[PDB]
Amino acid sequence: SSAYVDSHKWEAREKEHYCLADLASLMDKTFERKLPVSSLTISRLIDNISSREEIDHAEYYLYKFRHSPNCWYLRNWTIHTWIRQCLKYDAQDKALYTLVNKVQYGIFPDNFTFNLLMDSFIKKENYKDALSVVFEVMMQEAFEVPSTQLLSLYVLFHCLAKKTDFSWEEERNFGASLLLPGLKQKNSVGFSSQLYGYALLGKVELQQGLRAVYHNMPLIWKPGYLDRALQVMEKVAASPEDIKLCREALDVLGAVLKALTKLVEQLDIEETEQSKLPQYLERFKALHSKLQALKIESEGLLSLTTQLVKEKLSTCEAEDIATYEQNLQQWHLDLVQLIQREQQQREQA
Amino acid sequence: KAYRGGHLTIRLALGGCTNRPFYRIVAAHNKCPRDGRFVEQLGSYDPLPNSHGEKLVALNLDRIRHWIGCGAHLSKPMEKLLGLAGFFPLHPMMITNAERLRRKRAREVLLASQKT
Amino acid sequence: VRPRLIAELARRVRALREQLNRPRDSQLYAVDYETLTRPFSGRRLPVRAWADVRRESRLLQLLGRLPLFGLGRLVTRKSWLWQHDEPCYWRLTRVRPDYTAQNLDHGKAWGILTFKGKTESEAREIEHVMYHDWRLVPKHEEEAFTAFTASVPYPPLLRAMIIAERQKNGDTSTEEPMLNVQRIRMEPWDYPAKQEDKGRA
Amino acid sequence: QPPPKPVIVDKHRPVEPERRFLSPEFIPRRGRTDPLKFQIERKDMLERRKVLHIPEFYVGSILRVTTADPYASGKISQFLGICIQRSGRGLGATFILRNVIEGQGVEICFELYNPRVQEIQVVKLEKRLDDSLLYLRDALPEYSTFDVNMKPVVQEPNQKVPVNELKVKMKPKPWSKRWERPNFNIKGIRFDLCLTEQQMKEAQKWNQPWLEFDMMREYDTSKIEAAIWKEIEASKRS
Numbered sequence A: 001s002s003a004y005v006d007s008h009k010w011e012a013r014e015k016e017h018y019c020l021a022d023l024a025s026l027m028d029k030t031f032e033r034k035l036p037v038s039s040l041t042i043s044r045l046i047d048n049i050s051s052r053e054e055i056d057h058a059e060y061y062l063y064k065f066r067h068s069p070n071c072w073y074l075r076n077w078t079i080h081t082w083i084r085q086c087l088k089y090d091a092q093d094k095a096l097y098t099l100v101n102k103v104q105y106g107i108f109p110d111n112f113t114f115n116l117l118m119d120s121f122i123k124k125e126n127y128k129d130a131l132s133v134v135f136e137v138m139m140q141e142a143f144e145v146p147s148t149q150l151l152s153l154y155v156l157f158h159c160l161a162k163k164t165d166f167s168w169e170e171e172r173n174f175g176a177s178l179l180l181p182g183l184k185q186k187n188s189v190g191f192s193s194q195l196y197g198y199a200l201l202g203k204v205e206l207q208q209g210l211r212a213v214y215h216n217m218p219l220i221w222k223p224g225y226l227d228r229a230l231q232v233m234e235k236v237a238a239s240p241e242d243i244k245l246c247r248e249a250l251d252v253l254g255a256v257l258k259a260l261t262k263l264v265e266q267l268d269i270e271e272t273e274q275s276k277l278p279q280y281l282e283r284f285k286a287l288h289s290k291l292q293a294l295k296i297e298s299e300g301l302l303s304l305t306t307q308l309v310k311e312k313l314s315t316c317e318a319e320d321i322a323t324y325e326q327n328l329q330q331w332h333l334d335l336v337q338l339i340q341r342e343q344q345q346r347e348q349a
Numbered sequence B: 001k002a003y004r005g006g007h008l009t010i011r012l013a014l015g016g017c018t019n020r021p022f023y024r025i026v027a028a029h030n031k032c033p034r035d036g037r038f039v040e041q042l043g044s045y046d047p048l049p050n051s052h053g054e055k056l057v058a059l060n061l062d063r064i065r066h067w068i069g070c071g072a073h074l075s076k077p078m079e080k081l082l083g084l085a086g087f088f089p090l091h092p093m094m095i096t097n098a099e100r101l102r103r104k105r106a107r108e109v110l111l112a113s114q115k116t
Numbered sequence C: 001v002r003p004r005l006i007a008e009l010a011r012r013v014r015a016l017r018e019q020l021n022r023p024r025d026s027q028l029y030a031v032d033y034e035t036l037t038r039p040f041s042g043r044r045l046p047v048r049a050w051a052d053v054r055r056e057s058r059l060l061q062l063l064g065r066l067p068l069f070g071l072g073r074l075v076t077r078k079s080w081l082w083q084h085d086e087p088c089y090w091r092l093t094r095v096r097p098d099y100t101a102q103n104l105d106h107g108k109a110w111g112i113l114t115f116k117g118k119t120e121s122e123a124r125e126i127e128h129v130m131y132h133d134w135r136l137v138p139k140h141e142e143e144a145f146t147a148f149t150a151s152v153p154y155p156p157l158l159r160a161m162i163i164a165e166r167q168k169n170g171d172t173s174t175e176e177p178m179l180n181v182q183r184i185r186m187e188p189w190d191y192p193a194k195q196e197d198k199g200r201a
Numbered sequence D: 001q002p003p004p005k006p007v008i009v010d011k012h013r014p015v016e017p018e019r020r021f022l023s024p025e026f027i028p029r030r031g032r033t034d035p036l037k038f039q040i041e042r043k044d045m046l047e048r049r050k051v052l053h054i055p056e057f058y059v060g061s062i063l064r065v066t067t068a069d070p071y072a073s074g075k076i077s078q079f080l081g082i083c084i085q086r087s088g089r090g091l092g093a094t095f096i097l098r099n100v101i102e103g104q105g106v107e108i109c110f111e112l113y114n115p116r117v118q119e120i121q122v123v124k125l126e127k128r129l130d131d132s133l134l135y136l137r138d139a140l141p142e143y144s145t146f147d148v149n150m151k152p153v154v155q156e157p158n159q160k161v162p163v164n165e166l167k168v169k170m171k172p173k174p175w176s177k178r179w180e181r182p183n184f185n186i187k188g189i190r191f192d193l194c195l196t197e198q199q200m201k202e203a204q205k206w207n208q209p210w211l212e213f214d215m216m217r218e219y220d221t222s223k224i225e226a227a228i229w230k231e232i233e234a235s236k237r238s
């Protein structure tokens, strides 16, 4: 989707044409007198940047703005000015660095901007960068967007192309990321990916407890993830169509390997998950048998099904472009008034 | 001496020579000393028994209600004495102490019956 | 009468100086996790919060991982939800982090709150922001989580007092006296307080 | 997380490049003698310069010096002070420093080529309109009192010499040198308060305008300093 990716309006719309050195010296003076500064200066700077060391200056001054008296404003149009200025001048190492330590820089792209970023990632054909980036988007929890199809494709292709047997951080990241893209209640792919994510989350819990489930991850504290997976399976069997994949075999493997032979957050009356493993496994066998008695092809590769998602992808990209141009119009609306605001100070002077 | 902040408090003042305590429920400030000045003497209490064996205590109900309606915090020991009197609810710590003593006495009787 | 000026001089000078160069909120909230002592104070922490400060992080440390510190995003009072099965949260309205903080892990933020589904129409101030007992609820399972649905006799001596009084008045009034308990809204301990009313070093 | 690193680039073209500056002690004095002396002592101090840096400075600049002293804490002596003057030529060229501490005004005369000194540092690099700052004695102590552990004020790598245009108040009239006379041609001080119209009208009597109009006493330096640059460049190449 070259038309969906590229955009000449953003590149040839509202350029300031001020001196980069002048803006740098101004920002240096303002942040040496440690008084607050508007985002208009940073926006003009970013629009004026045309160089690598200039984007480096921009990264340093963005760190300074994060550590400046004002941090909450978080103007997404300035964020996307910076994103374009970085990605067109090809600093993916620095883009990824900022995106991973967002707490250090605080970049937060929206649906269309991030979809453009991930389309550039597709064009360059890299996997690990996109993987870390989709983990950071899982941290963001922003999936109710037209980029949900892109996120689903990414996760469902990378979990298959991973071929990594042992990594607890990575496995928890996958198990937590496989939920939010599928929450839009789409089809078999959707709720079965939700099922597999529930399975991975229960596995991570049973293997390293419930602490990391919520400590450095936004998630719910109900330990019965296996129970929730069983609930999903039984409600699906009760209810449409269920195109299935052999990841139920991975679920079987996890369940069997867990059935195989300090603070206590668990409640005394309710028994512990270690003691619940048995009935978990009996119910899992029972629901396996129910599903096979009820869809059961388990041959259609999920990554191949994501090209049929290209239909709704190409359908929703239009509304995404519409939202992006609406955002551009809103930005041109508010920014011209913000310029008159800066002129108010000179009128007073 | 005008104490900053603070609040009126009816509490126990100590009197009498050593080995003969005599308490006096009296209205005073929170920052007030033990036997420092007061505003109005309300009542008195003898923690020792008389010839009859009973112990002495006096309460000025009208003035106490006056001071409460005017606003004043109270001390746990005298509020416990009030709850024992009946003008005031009984003390939860009193209930707990009674229950502890009764459990301990039952335990002692059990140990005696075991030894015998 | 002889006046004195240096008193007010030093008073207002100290006022200006301390209000200018007061210790930063992040600076004085910082904690070293192996010794469990706040710098600039040399005080130890309570045994009940030792483990929570060792393990769990702070509110702004949680909010630094998402845009705008999650306006409307669900953070629940860990203490309230451990003390009661009902859901309790904070309708965070305004936020302001501390610029001097390195990780932007401290600041002030508040809005409307709710306790056992008792939502208040007042965007008032939070309490105990700096504690390590903050829990973020995602944007899923959130509606399911937030889903939620006489009198006593007087004391014996006092009722006897009133009996004697009304008997002297002349009426029989066999009815037993009572008071309002449904009016008296006994509030639990964990009801929040006024951050601005409580001071600061 | 690692910390970011600062970067600053301001590139107004005809400001950044400065080219030339010679040391005030390389050039010889008007006196007559064979230049062999000059060149031999010069190459001596230059193959010493290959070790020691002498960070360039001016009068009124603040220098922090560390030296190896026999009798001192750690056998080292560290002293900060403002540049009053640079006197002498050749190896014996020295510079004067001064500082007010504990209410006492102390000053040092440093040899900038003695091996006893370990190294030099420029805390600040500036220039006073006056070539000689000896009147800082009679000046107020608040002008000379400087901090010892103040960090070096960062200076650009290639920029012009900052010249502070200021003037200084002074102790009352009972001075030792009579700075008010026009023989010294000094401007940092303020007649308007240090004296009256009568005193300045009486002191300008000794004024002799013809000194600067004379042209047989002046010392040309162009070809001399040219040879100086030439031979220092030769020593650097070799």
Ligand SMILES: [Mg+2]
Pocket: D176, D177
């Ligand atoms: Mg003399």
